[PDB]
């Protein structure tokens, strides 16, 4: 086509979606990870994760307001990944990299799994 | 912080949100523009437009599944702007620039209004 493009548009959209999350505006699901609860937007979860994409395209699960993750999933690993989904920023540290990689493999977040594998290979 | 960043993350998120829109997945509102109807995600509309942000943060309007725009709004201008919201791409043409600018001013999409003003000033 003959379209023009606004370079910062996608980043600005994601920044506003994170502002809505921080104010709990139009969040439509709670993700339960052990004792911890995380509110989010189903569309953002689907856009970032192969697991949530499969869950919320399911004709029955698409209507659930509560999703319980596998008890092996670490709440801190999930929190770091949820922050990444809404910001593009990953808080990857020596003390959390194993839990982050395991959570990203479960959530099917291919690019995160790739950087964790590379950071582990280096050490 | 000591975060790493995935450059293409925001663009990939927006691409997936547009894929959900094209398949009518988790759309939660219909925007009525004269005789024309446009399905969308309230969160994406809020993230892109000062008008939708104000509408869906309203304690009563946040629950509406149908929003009717001012009858002066042109459906083609709205369609071009809705496509921009989900892609960062604006189909700005000599034949649509006046309707696009008027719709962007109504929707409170500051960056679109700015490029329309610049393109009009050049001609």
């Amino acid at each position: 086509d003959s379209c023009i493009q606004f370079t910062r548009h996608a980043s600005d959209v994601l920044l506003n979606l994170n502002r809505l999350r921080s104010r709990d505006i139009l969040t439509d699901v709670v993700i339960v990870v052990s004792r911890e609860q995380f509110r989010a937007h189903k569309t953002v979860l689907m856009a970032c994760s192969g697991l949530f994409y499969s869950i919320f395209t399911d004709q029955l699960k698409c209507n659930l307001s509560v999703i319980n993750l596998d008890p092996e999933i670490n709440p801190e690993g999930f929190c770091i990944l949820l922050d990444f989904m809404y910001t593009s920023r990953l808080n990857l540290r020596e003390g959390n990299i194993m839990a982050v990689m395991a959570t990203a493999m479960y959530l099917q977040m291919e690019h995160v799994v790739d950087t964790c594998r590379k950071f582990i290979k280096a050490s | 912080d000591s975060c790493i960043q995935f450059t293409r993350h925001a663009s990939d998120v927006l691409l997936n949100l547009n894929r959900l829109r094209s398949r009518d997945i988790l759309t939660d509102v219909v925007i009525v523009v004269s005789r024309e109807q446009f399905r969308a995600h309230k969160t994406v509309l809020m993230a892109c437009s000062g008008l939708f942000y104000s509408i869906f943060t309203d304690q009563l309007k946040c629950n509406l599944s149908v929003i009717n725009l001012d009858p002066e709004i042109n459906p083609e201008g709205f369609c071009i702007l809705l496509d921009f919201m989900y892609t960062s791409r604006l189909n700005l043409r000599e034949g649509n620039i006046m309707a696009v600018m008027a719709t962007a001013m109504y929707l409170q999409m500051e960056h679109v209004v700015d490029t329309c003003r610049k393109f009009i000033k050049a001609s």
Binding site: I4 | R89, L90
Partner: peptide, 4 residues
């Protein structure tokens, strides 16, 4: 704004 750019030409994509």
């Amino acid at each position: 704004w750019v030409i994509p």
